[PDB]
Amino acid sequence: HVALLPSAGMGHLTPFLRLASLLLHQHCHVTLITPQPTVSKAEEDLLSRFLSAFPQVNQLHFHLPPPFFLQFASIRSSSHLLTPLLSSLTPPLSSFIYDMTLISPLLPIAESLGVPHYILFTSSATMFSFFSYFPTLAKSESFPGKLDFVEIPGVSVSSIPRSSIPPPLLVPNSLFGKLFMEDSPKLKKLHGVLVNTFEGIEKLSLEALNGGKVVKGLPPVYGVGPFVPCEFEKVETISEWLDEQPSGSVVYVSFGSRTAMGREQLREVGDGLVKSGWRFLWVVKDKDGVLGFELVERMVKEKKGLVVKEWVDQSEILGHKAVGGFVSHCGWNSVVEAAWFGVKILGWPLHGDQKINAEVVAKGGWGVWKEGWDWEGERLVKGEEIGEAIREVMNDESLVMKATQVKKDARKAISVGGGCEVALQKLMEVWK
Numbered sequence: 123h124v125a126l127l128p129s130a131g132m133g134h135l136t137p138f139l140r141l142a143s144l145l146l147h148q149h150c151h152v153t154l155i156t157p158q159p160t161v162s163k164a165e166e167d168l169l170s171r172f173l174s175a176f177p178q179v180n181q182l183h184f185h186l187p188p189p190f191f192l193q194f195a196s197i198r199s200s201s202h203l204l205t206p207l208l209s210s211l212t213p214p215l216s217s218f219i220y221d222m223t224l225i226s227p228l229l230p231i232a233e234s235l236g237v238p239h240y241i242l243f244t245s246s247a248t249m250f251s252f253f254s255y256f257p258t259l260a261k262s263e264s265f266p267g268k269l270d271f272v273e274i275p276g277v278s279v280s281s282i283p284r285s286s287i288p289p290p291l292l293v294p295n296s297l298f299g300k301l302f303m304e305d306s307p308k309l310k311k312l313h314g315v316l317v318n319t320f321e322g323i324e325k326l327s328l329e330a331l332n333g334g335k336v337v338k339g340l341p342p343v344y345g346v347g348p349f350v351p352c353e354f355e356k357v358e359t360i361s362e363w364l365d366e367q368p369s370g371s372v373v374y375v376s377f378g379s380r381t382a383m384g385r386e387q388l389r390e391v392g393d394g395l396v397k398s399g400w401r402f403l404w405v406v407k408d409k410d411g412v413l414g415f416e417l418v419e420r421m422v423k424e425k426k427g428l429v430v431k432e433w434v435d436q437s438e439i440l441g442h443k444a445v446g447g448f449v450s451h452c453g454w455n456s457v458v459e460a461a462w463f464g465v466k467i468l469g470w471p472l473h474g475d476q477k478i479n480a481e482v483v484a485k486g487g488w489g490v491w492k493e494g495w496d497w498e499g500e501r502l503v504k505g506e507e508i509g510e511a512i513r514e515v516m517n518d519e520s521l522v523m524k525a526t527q528v529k530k531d532a533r534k535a536i537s538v539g540g541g542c543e544v545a546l547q548k549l550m551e552v553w554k
């Protein structure tokens with residue numbers, strides 16, 4: 123009997139439910155905690171579509187008193203409502219896995235239940251190393267004054283520069299600065315950490331965390347990745363356009379679930395897509411007259427472009443043989459999915475941990491990103507730079523060779539060898 127509690131956003135719910143599908147395939151009784159009302163429609167649509175495919179799971183409504191960052195505040199202030207709900211739960215609980223963003227409000231609740239509690243870090247293991255090493259950084263407070271690099275002993279990245287550090291972590295009066303210094307020291311009071319990653323992309327980061335060379339006192343981390351896409355996530359004009367395209371010729375473009383860019387940069391993106399000369403599938407989120415008539419015509423005249431304003435199935439598009447590239451913000455959910463389908467990534471990091479995640483795939487030899495593009499809103503990337511980066515990555519056949527090997531290691535990390543199978547079964551015996 124396992125208890126799950128994800129945070130808000132599709133970036134947190136998609137990996138959590140993929141973990142539940144793995145636990146259910148290992149024959150578990152999963153009790154999913156659902157903080158209602160849920161934020162986005164795509165979340166509650168993914169829920170009932172997941173609940174329908176698995177009627178055996180026990181959904182537990184977490185009712186909060188009276189958006190993504192707003193539900194953040196109501197849960198951590200009302201986390202004491204869960205320990206009466208989880209104590210009178212039959213069958214008796216055997217474990218509890220929640221999101222890392224909720225490690226502080228749920229640790230007292232988890233310790234009071236007396237069950238082995240864990241966290242599911244939805245980002246990379248390398249970012250988890252930066253998250254764990256951050257309290258050590260702030261105490262040697264030549265920071266952020268003289269700090270030029272962040273050298274974590276033995277991680278998969280060579281050296282994390284100052285440019286790749288999340289900007290709010292360099293400001294002393296920010297939320298994430300306080301959140302990092304408050305959440306990270308509580309990792310030691312845990313039984314373990316699940317991370318959606320496998321040995322084929324973060325071998326050195328996984329071994330450095332378990333080897334005790336990142337920070338002293340960490341619990342064992344478990345690479346239960348890759349979280350392969352499931353069928354309950356699928357809710358058909360897009361697939362019919364990709365079918366009539368040469369394989370490995372479509373450029374998939376997506377920046378996650380929010381895409382909070384500006385109207386200035388969006389014009390250059392679409393302009394850069396047509397200046398590259400490759401057929402593309404652009405996915406944009408508004409939350410409209412931005413596209414140029416000279417570009418809208420060329421998108422239709424050249425028979426190359428697709429632009430959509432809808433929650434597409436990224437797994438099908440990455441799984442389609444026509445898609446050979448991926449312009450990604452390098453959200454770890456998109457990265458692991460891109461690794462599973464062997465689609466080389468063009469890195470365009472925007473906020474937070476996306477510069478570090480982009481270097482993880484860059485060191486792996488199956489991804490290329492430009493340090494000079496910087497964070498979102500810092501400057502304007504011209505369409506020529508975007509057209510050149512796409513031309514550079516698409517012409518680069520060395521990436522698909524490494525991307526293929528990353529696909530092989532991904533398919534090998536779920537089955538007989540399977541660091542996921544090893545980690546999951548190692549957790550089952552502990553939960554006895």
Ligand SMILES: O=c1ccn([C@@H]2O[C@H](COP(=O)(O)OP(=O)(O)O[C@H]3O[C@H](CO)[C@H](O)[C@H](O)[C@H]3O)[C@@H](O)[C@H]2O)c(=O)[nH]1
Nearest residue numbers: 132133134136244245378379433434435436453454455456
């Ligand atoms: O049109 C779309 C857009 C997204 N997705 C899916 O929704 C998820 C999006 O997750 P990403 O990590 O790609 O994007 P987010 O912006 O949600 O990611 C954020 O939250 C993640 C979870 O914490 C990571 O931390 C990440 O670094 C951070 O940017 C993936 O399953 C992706 O395939 C779709 O199916 N269709």
